[PDB]
Design a protein around this ligand. Structure first.
Ligand SMILES: NC(=O)c1ccc[n+]([C@@H]2O[C@H](COP(=O)([O-])OP(=O)(O)OC[C@H]3O[C@@H](n4cnc5c(N)ncnc54)[C@H](OP(=O)(O)O)[C@@H]3O)[C@@H](O)[C@H]2O)c1
Ligand SMILES: COc1ccc([C@H]2c3cc(OC)c(OC)cc3CNN2C(=O)CCc2cc(Cc3cnc(N)nc3N)cc(OC)c2OC)cc1
Length: 162
C-alpha cells in the first residue's frame, strides 16, 4: 500500500526556504503516529531539512547522488525503486516527489493547515471530484497549537461508466 503524507495550507503551500512554514506540534505527532513502524520515502532536500532520519521507521531517501550514504538511511536512485519497497510506504515529500507520485498513490493523508502562509514549494492541485473523503477530523487547538487544521484521509475514486 502506497500513500502520500503531507501538510499543506489553504493555497497548497507545503514549504518555505526548505522548512515548514508553520509551527504545529500536533501535526508532527500526527506524522509520528501514522508512519511509525512503516516506511518513509523522501527527496534529498526534504531529508536535509530534517537533517537526521526519523526514529523507529525505515527512512528512504531518493537522490541522484551516488555518493549519498547516511547512517540510518536507505538510498534509492529512481522512482521505480519505490515500488519494490515492502509494507506501508508513505511518500513524505517534498514538492518534486509529490508531483511525481500523486497520480500513483492509493490514498493521501493530508493535514490542511487552515491558513495562508508564504511559501516557495507547493503540493500539486487535486480535486475532491477525484478523491473520496474517508475521514475528516478537526485538530484540537491549544496555546501551543494555535493554527486551525484538519486531518483528511483521502482515497482515490474508481472511474466507472455513468
Ligand atoms: N508536508 C509538508 O508540508 C512537507 C513535507 C515534506 C517536505 N516539505 C517541504 O518541501 C520542500 C522541498 O521540496 P523540493 O521539491 O524542493 O525537494 P524534495 O522533493 O524534498 O527533494 C528534491 C530532490 O529529490 C531528488 N529526487 C527527486 N526525484 C528524483 C528522481 N526521480 N530521481 C532521482 N532523484 C530524485 C533530487 O535530489 P538530488 O538533487 O540530490 O538528485 C531532487 O533534487 C521543503 O521546503 C520542505 O520544507 C513539506
Ligand atoms: C512536538 O511533537 C513532536 C515533535 C517532533 C517530532 C519528530 C519526531 C521525534 C521522534 O523522536 C522522539 C520520533 O520518534 C518516533 C518521531 C518523530 C516524528 N516527526 N518528527 C520530526 O521532527 C519530523 C518533522 C518534519 C516533517 C516533515 C514532512 C511532513 C510534515 N507534516 C506532514 N503532515 N507530513 C509530512 N510529510 C517535514 C519537515 O521539514 C521539512 C519536518 O521537520 C520540521 C514528533 C513529535
Amino acid at each position: 500500500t502506497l500513500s502520500i503524507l503531507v501538510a499543506h495550507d489553504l493555497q497548497r503551500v507545503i514549504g518555505f526556504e526548505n522548512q515548514l512554514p508553520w509551527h504545529l506540534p500536533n501535526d508532527l505527532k500526527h506524522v509520528k503516529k501514522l508512519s511509525t513502524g512503516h516506511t518513509l520515502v523522501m527527496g534529498r532536500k526534504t531529508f536535509e531539512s530534517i537533517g537526521k532520519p526519523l526514529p523507529n521507521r525505515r527512512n528512504v531517501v531518493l537522490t541522484s547522488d551516488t555518493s549519498f550514504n547516511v547512517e540510518g538511511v536507505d538510498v534509492i536512485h529512481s522512482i521505480e525503486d519505490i515500488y519494490q519497497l515492502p509494507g506501508h510506504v508513505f511518500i513524505f515529500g517534498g514538492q518534486t516527489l509529490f508531483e511525481e507520485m500523486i497520480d500513483k498513490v492509493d490514498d493521501m493523508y493530508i493535514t490542511v493547515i487552515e491558513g495562508k502562509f508564504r511559501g516557495d514549494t507547493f503540493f500539486p492541485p487535486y480535486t475532491f471530484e477525484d478523491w473520496e473523503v474517508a475521514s475528516s477530523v478537526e485538530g484540537k487547538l491549544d496555546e501551543k497549537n494555535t493554527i486551525p487544521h484538519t486531518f483528511l484521509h483521502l482515497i482515490r475514486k474508481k472511474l466507472v461508466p455513468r
